[PDB]
């Protein structure tokens, strides 16, 4: 009764995930040869010329969101959806640095020129700057109100500029961590932000055709720097700006919208700007001979010029530029990377290695060596061990496909009512049969090696046999509604079909006669499978439940919750009554049909799972998901015990009196230390509260004392600290700060230590300063309030005099009286 664990071995069929950014990397001294592309939870390094994967970098349970290569080239920073930041060494392939400051997906990662500081942006409205060499986080910036789009350093004055999904551009002084300047120009999201012309011009991309530029000059008055509106340049695309990028130490500015075309711009600087201005002036002089401020204005508009734009097959997600001829690499919705060369022509593609769409149908060969995966417009065959695509054939569409018992051929179904057959060696389509009127949904193989059965949107169910390979129709079975699934017993006796109505109807194969009906699902059954013995059939519906039925009498044994969403596929292992199911809740689960128990959960994928397939040996399972990836699981020798697995999911100050003593002692030590420091010319607690005098620090300690605990803390304090406190109290009254609190404390100590104070002659100077200060200050405060007596009372009488003039007199008197009656509670 012991179970065995299934473990994920490898991930294949993915070239590049739609989310992420493509970056060039430097390996073995070739700058443009190698590229780094993000996949689901992993990042892959590819060789464009060779077309193979040089290295893979391990990930942990979370998708990668953005990439940033280090300036030195040894490291590359990786950001994830969870919010953790990990840095990998390219040569070793192992990353040992983890940064987890953020709480949301890391939107951007950028380095400074030296490489010692790293700045990260997240969907949470924060920017965190990290110390790369020391592997620590320096500080967090909290100004923004929406998700962070871009963050860039400034080399000259140690400044950081950031943009966000809010309509704001914010300038930060990294020395003080203060936001000193904010731009409010834009009306919409600021998607792009780049620095050009040696940090003298600022370029922003927004959700409009116009592309704005500002000029920055270093020094509501402006602080540190000033920026003015230089102008705007038009964009051919009428949509939002997805990305703005400028290649390192180059003159090419690239603008990209949602459409497939990528727009390139070239800037003119240094002598080229001056030479163009001189040429324009000479032409203007020639025009004057034939028959300036306008010429200067023409030069300013023509400072940046439009070179020919690159066009791609499909829309672009991310791009990168390198300049020694310009080399541009691209990433599309299709898992396809392309390179174009321009001073445009396509130099290479890596289209081999993955389907162009999500894999809808998935099958294994009769032996375990081959794996069949088919999607829209493509069919590919995968070696299970070696893991490369053997052969590719174009197809109209893919919905269902079985592998014919002959190892040479394949058979697929289409959304159009057609069937196509191919040879693996020949790689060509044999013939196309208009099998069904509507969509063909399910296809089942016979127990004996002859024939197969098809069902689809056309309400009939048709039987086919093999006849160079060809198929012909023997007989058809006509039903009332649509057919979801067709699968018949390991013996050729019984046939089971699923209808659009929430029922599964069983028919005799020999006679095409009704035998049984299975009902009880709220939603129609998507997937069905029959055990090897034929005793049990398991049905899964769009409703979350899965039900086990016996074939002998049509009795329901059990109903299980299974997934949190609709179940997509179900299939038994060959040997025993164990089946695998996959649903839209990101999970794969296996169950024991006899004991009705949940044994395992596979948690590899990150999107909903379309299909699943189990090997005839039962060792290997392959699945497909909405994320464009294929994963392989294998059985392991390590035994699995249920309740030990079940618990795995369950797991997965100082008193007021003492404070005064320390404040006095700290004051005593420092005043000695400052005395020594001044003599030489001829602590951390203080900076913690901000740089203040040691006498000042004692004051807030007294303020921190609660009013109730004030009196007994003073009683506790010994007479040793009393003379120092009297000196410090005198300093407090002269400043005029919190005189009521200090005097209340001061009067209490004098009473309780009255006799001991009188004896000590050393205290004679102390009270003489105290006596003159205390009455002088208290009288001053009382006089200020006392002066407010006269002004307020006089102004009170003047307002009363004006009301007397108005006094209809009874109505005014009633109205005047009515205002001045408040209401109070009273127990009568």
């Amino acid at each position: 009764k012991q179970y065995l664990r299934y473990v994920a071995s490898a991930v294949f069929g993915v070239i590049g995930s739609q989310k992420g950014n493509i970056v060039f990397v430097t390996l073995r001294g070739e700058k443009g040869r190698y590229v780094a592309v993000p996949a689901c939870e992993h990042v892959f390094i590819w060789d464009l010329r060779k077309g193979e994967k040089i290295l893979i970098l391990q990930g942990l349970k979370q998708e990668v969101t953005c990439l940033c290569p280090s300036p030195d080239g040894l490291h590359l920073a990786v950001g994830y959806e969870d919010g953790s930041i990990r840095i990998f060494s390219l040569l070793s392939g192992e990353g040992n640095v983890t940064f987890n400051g953020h709480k949301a997906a890391i939107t951007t990662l950028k380095y400074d020129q030296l490489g010692g500081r790293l700045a990260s942006g997240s969907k949470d409205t924060d920017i965190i700057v990290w110390d790369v060499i020391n592997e620590s986080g320096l500080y967090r910036l909290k100004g923004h109100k929406d998700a962070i789009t871009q963050a860039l350093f400034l080399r000259e004055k140690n400044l950081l500029v950031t943009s966000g999904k809010d309509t704001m551009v914010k300038w930060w002084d990294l020395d003080t961590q203060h936001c000193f300047k904010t731009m409010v120009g834009h009306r919409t999201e600021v998607w792009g932000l780049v620095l050009l012309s040696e940090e003298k011009r600022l370029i922003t991309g927004a959700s409009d055709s116009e592309l704005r530029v500002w000029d920055i000059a270093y020094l509501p008055e402006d602080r540190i720097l000033s920026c003015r509106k230089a102008g705007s340049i038009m964009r051919e695309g009428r949509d939002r700006v997805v990305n703005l990028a400028v290649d390192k130490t180059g003159r090419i500015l690239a603008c990209h919208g949602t459409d497939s075309v990528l727009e390139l711009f070239c800037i003119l600087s240094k002598k080229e700007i001056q030479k163009k201005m001189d040429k324009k002036m000479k032409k203007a002089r020639k025009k004057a001979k034939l028959h300036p401020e306008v010429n200067v204005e023409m030069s300013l508009q023509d400072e940046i010029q439009r070179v020919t734009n690159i066009k791609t097959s499909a829309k672009i997600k991310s791009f990168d530029l390198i300049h020694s001829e310009l080399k541009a690499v691209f990433l599309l919705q299709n898992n396809l990377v392309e390179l174009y060369s321009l001073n445009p022509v396509r130099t290479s593609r890596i289209t081999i290695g993955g389907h162009r769409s999500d894999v809808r149908t998935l099958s294994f060969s009769s032996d375990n060596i081959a794996v069949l995966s088919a999607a829209a417009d493509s069919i590919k065959i995968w070696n299970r061990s070696t893991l490369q695509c053997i052969r590719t054939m174009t197809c109209e569409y893919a919905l269902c496909s079985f592998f014919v018992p002959g190892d040479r051929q394949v058979v697929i179904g289409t959304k159009t009512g057609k069937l196509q057959l191919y040879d693996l060696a020949s790689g060509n389509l044999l013939e196309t049969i208009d099998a069904h009127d509507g969509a063909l949904w399910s296809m089942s193989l016979s127990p004996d090696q002859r024939g197969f059965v098809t069902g689809g949107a056309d309400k009939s169910v048709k039987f086919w046999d093999f006849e160079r390979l060809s198929v012909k129709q023997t007989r058809t079975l006509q039903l009332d509604e649509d057919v979801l699934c067709v699968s018949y017993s390991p013996n050729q006796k019984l046939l089971a079909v699923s209808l659009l109505d929430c029922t599964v109807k069983i028919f005799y194969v020999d006679t095409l006669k009704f035998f049984l009906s299975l009902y009880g699902h709220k939603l129609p059954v998507i997937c069905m499978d029959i055990s090897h013995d034929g005793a049990l059939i398991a049905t899964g519906s769009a409703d979350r439940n899965v039900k086990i039925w016996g074939l002998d009498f049509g009795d329901c044994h059990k109903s299980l919750f299974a997934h949190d969403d609709s179940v997509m596929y179900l299939q038994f292992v060959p040997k025993s009554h164990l089946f695998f199911t996959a649903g839209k809740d990101h999970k794969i689960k296996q169950w024991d049909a006899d004991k009705f128990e949940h044994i395992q959960t596979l948690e590899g994928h990150h999107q909903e799972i379309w299909c699943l397939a189990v090997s005839p040996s039962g060792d290997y399972v392959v699945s497909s998901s909405h994320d464009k990836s294929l994963r392989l699981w294998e059985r392991t020798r390590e035994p699995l015990i249920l309740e030990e697995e079940r618990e795995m999911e369950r797991e997965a100050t100082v008193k007021a009196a003492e404070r005064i003593m320390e404040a006095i002692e700290l004051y005593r030590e420092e005043t000695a230390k400052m005395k020594e420091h001044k003599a030489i010319c001829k602590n951390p607690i203080l900076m913690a509260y901000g740089s203040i005098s040691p006498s000042a620090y004692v004051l807030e300690i007294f303020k921190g004392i609660k009013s109730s605990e004030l009196e007994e803390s003073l009683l506790v304090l010994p007479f040793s600290y009393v003379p120092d406190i009297l000196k410090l109290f005198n300093e407090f009254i002269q400043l005029g700060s919190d005189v009521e609190l200090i005097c209340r404390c001061l009067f209490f100590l004098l009473r309780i230590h009255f006799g001991q104070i009188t004896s000590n002659q050393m205290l004679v100077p102390v009270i003489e300063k105290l006596r003159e200060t205390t009455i002088s200050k208290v009288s001053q405060v009382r006089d200020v309030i006392g002066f407010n007596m006269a002004g307020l009372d006089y102004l009170k009488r003047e307002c009363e005099a004006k009301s007397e003039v108005m006094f209809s007199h009874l109505e005014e008197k009633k109205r005047k009286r009515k205002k001045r009656e408040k209401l109070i509670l009273t127990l009568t």
């Binding site: 949904w441 939603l523 997509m568």
Partner: peptide, 8 residues
């Protein structure tokens, strides 16, 4: 309800 929504 159509099979395009539920399965495809």
């Amino acid at each position: 309800i159509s099979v395009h929504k539920l399965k495809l």
